[PDB]
């Protein structure tokens, strides 16, 4: 009905410069409800399960260690139609093909080292919520 | 010549959270001239005259009371080519079909409860100025 | 009980550069309630009544015309303990004796041309509300 | 040596309006290092242990439920001389005795419902880190 | 390899209102490296060489003196793929055909008096770097 | 009369993180006039002349190389009563003895590595203008 949850995590590239701000600011500007915010140094198994469909890539081996090197912050948000709303908030993957006024279109430099990853589909979010955010760790209201 | 006036009013949905700020900020940053700013609890006749062409709508009855429930703020602005400039500043009606970096594309959630209404055309503005903003209540310079 | 109203008006010196923004932003960020916002080109009688106790001043004649030259914006706000809260928000009259992070301590240059005037006391506000803001023009909630 | 940790938690009063932003922004502006960020609905035992020295207060019973009503967010930060630096960042308890440009001096309204609580002393932080933030849940670097 | 330099200068129209900020902010928000920042009152020979290919224009005579009247600020930036990045950062020349969230799409009013000019191509920058920014006046790192 | 010039330079510590923004923003918020902005890698002679009265200090040798290691940006500003106005804008040297809402009171961590240096007195500015900012490189208006 109105329990659309979206998993979004900030890659360590931004947290090196911090810049965690203005993200929740944009989220509340749109008017979304925070449901959870937990950050942990995810182990290699979690990273490979996150990109199990992307393992057969030469860049997969590089990224699975590059993002592992620094600490990472994960977050889940609740809102109506938040699916694809987060996507349009971020912007398309390629920095060149990313208009300003967005997240990916105003901060990222290269596809190799981006800052934000998210759920492409509701079905993807249905597993991006689990195995990293343990249950009964959120708020329902 | 250069007397293009545009009537723009903030619906009570935003004033519930306030958030009246940054609007005049964007207007002055673009470089528009304020001509008037008056707010009143508009009566039902004013609301129905505002949407006389939209009366034959099932959603009209709901909105004409929903926006009447809270207090509203109205505003008029003077600037060159401000017509359709305000429109591109806000964004298209549907929140999904509204890119970020705008007004309607960064704050609104659903078409039912939006925050900003404006003049689609110059002819529309020619009556949106009147019957709510009483004359000799503005500044010409 | 909780009906503390404060009259605050922005002098034309700032409206020349606009800069009306961030004021309502600070007010809502503190958590005050807007009760009214009307602006008019005040006549000489209104200005002299505003400073009837300051008429016997050589600078009074200069200011009563300098601020009259441009348009002015007046505003009233409702909040608990807003009295002297607005004062500490603005800062002491002399720009030199005004710490940063405030209104008067971050924008004003000289005592001759300031941007904001306010109510020193509750009794002062009891008349600063009237004779400029006509009654039944506010919102009680 | 350089492992000064400070426990700071945002009370639900602000999270009702969100406003979690700009806090990490100020922290990175000063140049502090984030060490942990976890939020949970703290049980009554945690709240009473937090204010064990304040239990013999009539206001204690009210606050221990008022802050429990909504969800709360806790946070720990690492930085040199962060002790009393967080304190001067927030401001003195009474909103009246709190200059602007701070946290407590720019957001809070009344002593009854504040938004931020922190560690008065290093010894206080030595227990404010524990019993809420479980160990091996932070980052050392 | 990674020595892509772009010459960008702010026309005096903005410097009349200042507004030099939020420009470098976006550059560091994207994460570009500053290589040089010098401002001088450019002489007519410098101005005509800047628009040598635009001399045969009726508007050329007007613009060459309009921006000459006030002081101008020039700047050069270093970054990967910086070319066409500033171009999309500003926006297309016509203010009407310029979406918000950008520089040209959020500040300029008319094509006659814009605020920012830049290098369309790398080859254009290869002469825009010289004859205004004297060599050995930058930083390589 | 009204030609009060103040020399202010940003140390490389901040330029490592950039953060050059918001400084000109505060300056225009107060309403000061920019007169010059030039940045160069100052040689050792310039640095020792800058602190000729501070040479007989053990920390002098460390700082004269620490600030020389990175590039530095210098700036001069024109405004009425700008003397000691810049000082109150920055804040007292010790970060602990520096209230928030300022420059030194919101960014600096330790006295060893600060970000901003300025002119204590008008007489000091009378030489801080020269020997670094070459004459006929400013704007008088």
Residue numbers in the entry:
A (entry chain E), B (entry chain F), C (entry chain C), D (entry chain B), E (entry chain A), F (entry chain D): 2 to 142
Task: Give sentences from the paper.
A major role of NME1 is the synthesis of nucleoside triphosphates, other than ATP.
The hexameric structure remained unaltered, even in these putatively oligophosphorylated states. Although heterogeneity posed a challenge in visualizing individual oligophosphorylation states, a larger density around ppS94 was identified. We were able to verify that this density corresponds to the pppS94 species localized at Ser94, with a likely further decrease in distance between His118 and the terminal phosphate. This analysis revealed three subsets with different extents of cryo-EM density appearing around ppSer94, which is indicative of the presence of different chain-length oligophosphates. Class 1 contained 37% of sorted particles and exhibited only little additional density, which probably corresponds to pppSer94 in a different orientation, whereas class 2 (32% of particles) and class 3 (31% of particles) had larger densities, possibly indicative of higher phosphorylation states. Furthermore, class 3 showed a connection between the additional density found for the oligophosphate chain and the density for the loop consisting of residues Lys65–Phe61, which includes the positively charged Arg58 that could interact with the negatively charged oligophosphates. Next, the impact of oligophosphorylation on protein–protein interactions was explored using oligo-pS94-NME1, which was generated by treating ppS94-NME1 with ATP.
